[PDB]
From Swiss-Prot:
Pfam families: Trypsin. It is found in: Secreted; Cytoplasmic granule. Glycans are attached at residues 59, 82. PROSITE patterns: TRYPSIN_DOM, TRYPSIN_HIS, TRYPSIN_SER. Major secreted protease of mast cells with suspected roles in vasoactive peptide generation, extracellular matrix degradation, and regulation of gland secretion. This is Chymase. It comes from Homo sapiens (Human).
Length: 215
């Protein structure tokens, strides 16, 4: 998160930290959010060979009792996910067990909020601590330069006049507007000039519900 503030610890109890393992490279990192005790929503580009989820985290380097490190048994990438366009950048992860409900872990032009452990700047490393920022929801013409952006599929997020933005490592995390999850962090520019592209959750709700009811 660029230009945000450190969260009050455990104030966003649905937030999930994803370590993503591939066969030909070192660990990758994503965000995500708990919508059932055994399901986490995130972005499809965060898929890999295997994934471990950490709930209850704030400072991701300092292990504490709030932590629940949970195995992912199955990844459900949208069947129409496109790795070039990032169309339909949404994925469900089924946890091996139901997480415990605690204080620190629970299920989940207007201003919206997004949080994550991602980079704090173009050359800055990933944040140790959960960070959050307020961003403006923009009319779709603001994201026109992203040639494969589509207003029905995706939100345009982040005033281009400001620095504030989600950035690398913040992928998969929720965009909350007035307390409700509206988007998922998908992609933006390398230089981190906003706006950024987020998955529009509303369009995918029937698909989300199909996956939950079969699993
Ligand atoms: C479909 O089209 C695209 C797909 C991917 C990327 N793209 N490219 C990057 C690069 O290194 O070139 C890069 O770093 N990021 C990460 C990134 C940059 C800014 C904001 C975010 C966040 F969290 F979404 F908000 C992520 C990225 O998504 C860019 C595209 O279109 C130019
Ligand atoms: C094991 C570890 O990373 N601990 C570091 C410590 O070395 C550093 O001096 C300080 C910075 O806030 O606290 C933290
Ligand atoms: C997070 O914890 C690590 C290890 O104690 C420390 O290096 C880092 O400074 C901490 N960051 C905070 C509390 O912002
Ligand atoms: C992904 O998108 C490109 C560009 O529109 C399309 O031509 C390509 O065949 C797609 N790939 C899949 C497997 O969806
Ligand atoms: Zn704590």
């Amino acid at each position: 998160i660029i230009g945000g503030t450190e969260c009050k610890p455990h104030s966003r109890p649905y937030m999930a930290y994803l370590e993503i393992v591939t066969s030909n490279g070192p660990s990758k990192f994503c965000g995500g959010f708990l919508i059932r005790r055994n399901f986490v929503l995130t972005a499809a580009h965060c898929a890999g060979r295997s994934i471990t989820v950490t709930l209850g985290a704030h400072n991701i380097t300092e292990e504490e009792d709030t932590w629940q490190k949970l195995e992912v048994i199955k990844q459900f990438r949208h069947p129409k996910y496109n790795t070039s366009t990032l169309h339909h950048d949404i994925m469900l992860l089924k946890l091996k067990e139901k997480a415990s409900l605690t204080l620190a872990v629970g299920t989940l032009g207007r201003m919206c909020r997004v949080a994550g452990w991602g980079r704090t700047g173009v050359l800055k490393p990933g944040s140790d601590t959960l960070q959050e920022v307020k961003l403006r929801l923009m009319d779709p013409q603001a994201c026109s330069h992203f040639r494969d952006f589509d207003h029905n599929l995706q939100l345009c997020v982040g005033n281009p006049r400001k620095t504030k933005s989600a950035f690398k490592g913040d992928s998969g995390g929720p965009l909350l507007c007035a307390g409700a999850a509206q988007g998922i962090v998908s992609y933006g520019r390398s230089d981190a000039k906003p706006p950024a592209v987020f998955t529009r959750i509303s369009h995918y709700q029937p698909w989300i519900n199909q996956i939950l009811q079969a699993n």
